[PDB]
Symmetry: D2
Subunit: 269 residues, 4 copies
């Protein structure tokens, strides 16, 4: 059967607020069954046409023949890991395929960003790897790059229970930190990048940072708006940082992740 797989994404990377996004090896995967009188989705969030994926697909191609689907998703909802981004992207993939739109990837990002308000999760979800973006009156501009080899450790706690202006000088400083972070990543200088990443001028964070940084992690920052914390580290520290973070006795899932090099895929299994 036709399958659609879309990865988690972390947006912001600290000072890259609303600009940088990175795709991760955690996935929303769909499995398309036969045609039918109505939309349904077998899963473990609406099971019918009201589901984001379907509303999105129907927005692109209103006349899609309904289908039954099966959905598996190891991206936790409302946790800053691009669940919602991944669902919207899947919906774009659904329609592109069933109605044979043959959309360019540049097109799928434009559509996704417009739906979402912001391009920072959806561009990497479509394109894979690391995407540096901007929305300037009307259009998206983005550049894709290959993130340096490193390990990621996702400290994923439970879902959350719940400025107008900025002084010129502080705005400037915030932009230049993002600037240096980006230049540093592009030099494979993960030490300096990590140090910029933790200076986000725009809970448990200080703890996870103290622990990870003291063993040689590059950085620990909020993924998107949170509450998951992402640790960037040398590979040889991945297992040991996981173990060390698990000791904190906080109620959380501690995962080993990589950068997902490929974006949304449609394939048969």
């Amino acid at each position: 059967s036709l399958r659609i797989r879309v990865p988690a994404t972390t947006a912001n990377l600290g000072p890259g607020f609303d600009s940088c996004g990175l795709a991760l090896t955690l996935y929303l995967t769909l499995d398309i069954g036969a045609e039918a009188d109505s939309w349904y989705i077998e899963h473990n969030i609406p099971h019918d046409e009201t589901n984001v994926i379907i509303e999105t697909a129907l927005n692109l191609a209103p006349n899609l023949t309904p289908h039954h689907l099966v959905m598996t998703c190891d991206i936790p909802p409302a946790r800053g890991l691009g669940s919602s981004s991944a669902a919207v992207v899947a919906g774009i993939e659904l329609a592109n395929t069933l109605a044979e739109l043959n959309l360019s990837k540049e097109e799928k990002v434009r559509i996704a960003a417009e739906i979402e308000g912001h391009p920072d999760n959806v561009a990497p979800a479509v394109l894979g790897n690391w995407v540096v973006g901007a929305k300037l009156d009307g259009e998206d501009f983005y550049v894709r790059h290959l993130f340096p080899d490193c390990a990621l450790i996702a400290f994923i706690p439970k879902a959350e229970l719940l400025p107008d202006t900025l002084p010129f000088k502080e705005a400037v400083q915030a932009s230049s930190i993002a600037n240096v972070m980006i230049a540093a990543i592009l030099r494979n200088d993960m030490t300096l990048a990590g140090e910029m990443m933790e200076r986000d001028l725009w809970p448990h964070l200080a703890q996870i940072r103290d622990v990870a940084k003291n063993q040689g992690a590059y950085a620990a920052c909020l993924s998107g708006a949170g509450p998951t914390v992402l640790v960037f580290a040398p590979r040889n520290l991945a297992n040991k940082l996981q173990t060390s973070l698990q000791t904190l006795e906080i109620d959380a899932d501690v995962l080993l992740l990589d950068v997902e090099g490929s974006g949304a895929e449609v394939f048969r299994e």
Copy 2:
């Protein structure tokens, strides 16, 4: 004799305000002479550029090394003062190199940048003046962080005469201006100078301004990337593929704008201290 050479720089590259800057092939050259009763600099730069201890170079030098023995010096400088090409910042860097050499401070490049940025209040002329090439920087009360990258490009400078004479930003505006500089930096590193040039032309954060659209039209219609004010102005820089440099100079010279049209390259080397006959 002992010589100190420091390059011109163009700062505030696109929305890289107080962040991005680029060293250029114009130079402040000092030739250090004999010890003496007091400081003198021989030069013919004109304007109100002093020849004594009040010259920026010397005050900067004495600020790092108060107890220095004075010298006579000879100065060549084809970086026009107050023209947006980092004349002021080259002089500060030159004073740092003077003190560092004559008082044997053995400062690292890192310390020299830190020191020059503290003096100037921003890092984006001084870091490329010390480090060469293209520097992305941040001065964050306390310290300086910077990355040096290779800029891909020739530059055509409209250099006019010296000029005769925002408190707060909406959050969203600041976020957006940041994202444009981010994209500019990322694009440069794909060698996508077309996209970079497009980002570089947005401001978001003088005499040649009313001719900017016209300079753009002409330059970009032949394949130039962008035309921008250099730093705070008033010089305008046109960024262009290297193969286009000569023909772009000639072409822009036909506009008969009141400015010298000069061809500059990216200068890869920062400030140097060396012996030459």
Copy 3:
């Protein structure tokens, strides 16, 4: 209908002989029709099961239900632009899809390289963009990178009508030129890279070089084993180099090409 698109590739890039390959915006595209008693392919090279695509697919999945297909290919055969590579890759795509193998891309390259003897065309054809490869007793090792933005001009003449050892010192020099070429490309230093590219130590070339280099092209080298010549240039020179090369009155197609960022794709149109 399900479509498969696979790009042209240039291998060698001079001193990167048997190691570097780059995907280009010229394509072999397949269009899969309904099932049938036998394989057939409508095209403008075998029309039946003997076709490379089909022999390859059947090698992966011997039990594929036969199909009718339509094939469009603007890659010229036997011209050093990876026609044959592209057909083999298409065949891999065919089987992966029809028999639902869900092969990883790493797998498709391994399979393709094994069929071909060498990984230098097939890896970029699968992976897209620029691939630096090696075959070391048993396995492939390759790294993908993003080739610097530039324009390509393919001087494509007609099909061709038709050492054991190397002194230590010359071998070393050849490797170090490739080394410097690669380091240069990775610094976005296309001037130095082009100058290394033209020093390949392992007809019409000298002419095309004199013409292209004298206007500011980075380089002109044989694509694969030839006879097409590829010119690498600043973008603003693309149109004018095309026009200038067309004046040579040689019997050739002069094309404007880009680096294809994406590898083989399977999609509906």
Copy 4:
């Protein structure tokens, strides 16, 4: 006083034969004294390292500047001679810097590399000694081409005592060895030091060799990238993530191999000439 400092280098990185090399945090330091009747270098380096005009540094200097006035000099050097860490090449570079400074030749970095490579017969110690960091080079009868990149890494050096004491290749073998260095270079630039380290360990083109497998087993089983001969040997270098440096040193010291186990870093700066008190 006038000082010249030049770093150690490890060349022949993987199959980057006569091509790839890397500057390291060990130094040859010269302190230049008064003009004199003849050359003398004060030092306690041992071996047959001369103190007069026959010392490599001085012969190199006189070869660029025959008419130089002699000086007395003081030499500190913690790069062990003939140990595969570019002792010889640091001395040649130091002589170039001496002549360039005392005869005011004002040679560019490019010319200094060209000159040092011509003297040594290969560029892969001397280019990183001049340029710093990691240099990929080619010496192609006539000229030199090189690219400087940032190496990602700490190094653990097994430095033993000085050692007590192919004409042609099958085409296919040469092509393959080239492809391995190509991959090594490409992998380094993805920050994939695991893959790089794997390529770096293949030869294709002394005293510590029989312990190499053992050093590998131990180092790589804790997360090191690779263990290789440095240049022609005899020192062995272990390449490892920086966070592992200290614990790797300690760990490798338990093998009780007859060699000093030293911790080195990548040195970013090439040869420097500077004043210090």
